[PDB]
Amino acid sequence: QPIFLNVLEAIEPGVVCAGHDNNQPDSFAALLSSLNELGERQLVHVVKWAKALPGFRNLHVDDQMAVIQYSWMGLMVFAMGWRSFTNVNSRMLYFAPDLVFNEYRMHKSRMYSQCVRMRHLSQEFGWLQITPQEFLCMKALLLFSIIPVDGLKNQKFFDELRMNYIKELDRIIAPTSCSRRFYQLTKLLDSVQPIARELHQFTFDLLIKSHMVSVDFPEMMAEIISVQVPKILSGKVKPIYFHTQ
Numbered sequence: 001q002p003i004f005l006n007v008l009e010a011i012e013p014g015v016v017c018a019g020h021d022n023n024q025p026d027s028f029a030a031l032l033s034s035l036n037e038l039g040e041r042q043l044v045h046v047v048k049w050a051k052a053l054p055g056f057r058n059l060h061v062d063d064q065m066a067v068i069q070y071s072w073m074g075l076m077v078f079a080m081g082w083r084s085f086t087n088v089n090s091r092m093l094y095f096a097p098d099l100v101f102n103e104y105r106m107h108k109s110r111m112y113s114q115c116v117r118m119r120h121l122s123q124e125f126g127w128l129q130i131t132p133q134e135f136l137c138m139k140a141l142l143l144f145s146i147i148p149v150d151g152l153k154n155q156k157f158f159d160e161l162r163m164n165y166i167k168e169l170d171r172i173i174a175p176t177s178c179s180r181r182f183y184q185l186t187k188l189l190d191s192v193q194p195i196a197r198e199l200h201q202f203t204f205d206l207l208i209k210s211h212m213v214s215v216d217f218p219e220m221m222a223e224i225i226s227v228q229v230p231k232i233l234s235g236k237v238k239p240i241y242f243h244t245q
Ligand SMILES: Cn1c(C#N)ccc1-c1ccc(O)cc1F
Pocket: 032, 035, 036, 038, 039, 040, 042, 076, 077, 080, 095, 096, 199, 202, 203, 206
């Protein structure tokens, strides 16, 4: 019985729309406001998803929140890359059904470079022939891939929970074929982190200058970006990497 995989498939968030008006000509303010609102909508789903993961409540309740808050960006990028792979074969970024980015929107959003990398991430799902099951366990493992340098309140329970998720990834892979596969997947998991960092910087700078540019940041978005993201950007909170960068 595939108990672990059953849980992941069962708790996997459905479609989330951004509420973007696609009848109005593209503007930087409207495009970035819709992404932020999508971020907010998505956060809600990421919280409910993470809280339903196997063993997640073994974590200290305060570590539960931190982990979600540090990981959210990378979790969203990775899932978005998947959506883009399965819906449009990575030809465009499928943020939401009502928010698909072509190259014009990539350019109008002033985050073309970040978009380029995200789309490259999406292409990798196709290049490496990632299975939905690999995707599911990789995404779960992403939640436990970023922690403070000073450690969590109960680090031991995190370490065990992360160890078990790596073991689960091992299992859906399962000797030279497996060692090759594990190498490829962990390299893929590592590649999400520099991308998330670029989006962390962009979203942070944007929050600071938000009033100047008429870009709206929803309550939960503005809080994380100003309280938790600077902890990452200042080097206090760091990715866990499989390979040396
Ligand atoms: C909505 N979204 C996804 C998804 N799905 C990945 C990255 C972002 C994002 C980008 C810039 C920003 O200012 C706010 C954001 F929420």
